[PDB]
């Protein structure tokens, strides 16, 4: 599923991301835009053989099982395919674990390079939340 901006913002808010660990909703929407272009089915292979999955491009090296990332962990205890669902629950729940792990949203390289320090509220402007 490819979400619209406000549609995803609303879904993220319902799933508890608004100000989760101090990150306002615009941060999460901005991250999703640059990570996946709001597409729940997005996958991208990393140089190390791991793969990033879903709206927040969650990495198989640490967070989910895809059966083809040798020596990896599955810290969210989920198959990576669950991260591609039209239902974002699995992605949100796993993102909460990631963002709580010490480095905050710096886990998402696109967030660090493209969202951090920017007017992230613009991503939710005009949305009936
Ligand atoms: Cl915001
Ligand atoms: Cl990740
Ligand atoms: Cl694996
Ligand atoms: Cl933080
Ligand atoms: Na689609
Ligand atoms: Na914070
Ligand atoms: Na993609
Ligand atoms: Na894909
Ligand atoms: Na992989
Ligand atoms: Na997803
Ligand atoms: Na995801
Ligand atoms: Na795994």
From Swiss-Prot:
- What keywords does the record list, in alphabetical order? Allergen, Antimicrobial, Bacteriolytic enzyme, Disulfide bond, Glycosidase, Hydrolase, Secreted, Signal
Q: What class of enzyme is it?
A: hydrolase
Q: Which residues form the active site?
A: 35, 52
Q: Which GO terms describe its biological process?
A: cell wall macromolecule catabolic process; defense response to bacterium; defense response to Gram-negative bacterium; defense response to Gram-positive bacterium; killing of cells of another organism
Which GO MF term does the entry hold, naming one? identical protein binding
Keyword rRNA processing included in the entry's annotation: no
Against SUPFAM superfamilies, the record matches this protein to: Lysozyme-like (SSF53955)
Query: Which residues of this UniProt protein bind substrate?
Result: 101
Domain of life of the organism encoding this protein: Eukaryota
Cellular component GO terms, alphabetical: cytoplasm; endoplasmic reticulum; extracellular space
One of its Pfam families is: Lys
Disulphide-bonded residues: 6-127, 30-115, 64-80, 76-94
This enzyme's EC code(s):
3.2.1.17
The reaction(s) catalysed by this protein are:
Hydrolysis of (1->4)-beta-linkages between N-acetylmuramic acid and N-acetyl-D-glucosamine residues in a peptidoglycan and between N-acetyl-D-glucosamine residues in chitodextrins
Tell me the ranges covered by the C-type lysozyme domain, including all copies: 1-129
UniProt-annotated location(s): Secreted
Tissues expressing the protein: In the egg white and polymorphonuclear leukocytes.
Q: What is its main location?
A: secreted
| Record's function text | Lysozymes have primarily a bacteriolytic function; those in tissues and body fluids are associated with the monocyte-macrophage system and enhance the activity of immunoagents. Has bacteriolytic activity against M.luteus.
The record makes one more remark, namely: Lysozyme C is capable of both hydrolysis and transglycosylation; it also shows a slight esterase activity. It acts rapidly on both peptide-substituted and unsubstituted peptidoglycan, and slowly on chitin oligosaccharides.
Question: Which family, according to UniProt?
Answer: Belongs to the glycosyl hydrolase 22 family.
Assembly, per entry? Monomer.
**What protein am I looking at?**
Lysozyme C
Q: Which organism is it from?
A: Gallus gallus
């Amino acid at each position: 599923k490819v979400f619209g901006r406000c549609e995803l913002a609303a879904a993220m808010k319902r799933h508890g991301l608004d100000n989760y660990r101090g990150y306002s909703l615009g941060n999460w929407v901005c991250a999703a835009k640059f990570e996946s272009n709001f597409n729940t089915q997005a996958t991208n292979r990393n140089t190390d053989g791991s793969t990033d999955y879903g709206i927040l491009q969650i990495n198989s090296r640490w967070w989910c099982n895809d059966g083809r990332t040798p020596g990896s962990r599955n810290l969210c205890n989920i198959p990576c395919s669950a991260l591609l669902s039209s239902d974002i629950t699995a992605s949100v729940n796993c993102a909460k674990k990631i963002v709580s792990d010490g480095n905050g949203m710096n886990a998402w390289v696109a967030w660090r390079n493209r969202c951090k320090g920017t007017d992230v509220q613009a991503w939710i402007r005009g949305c009936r939340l």
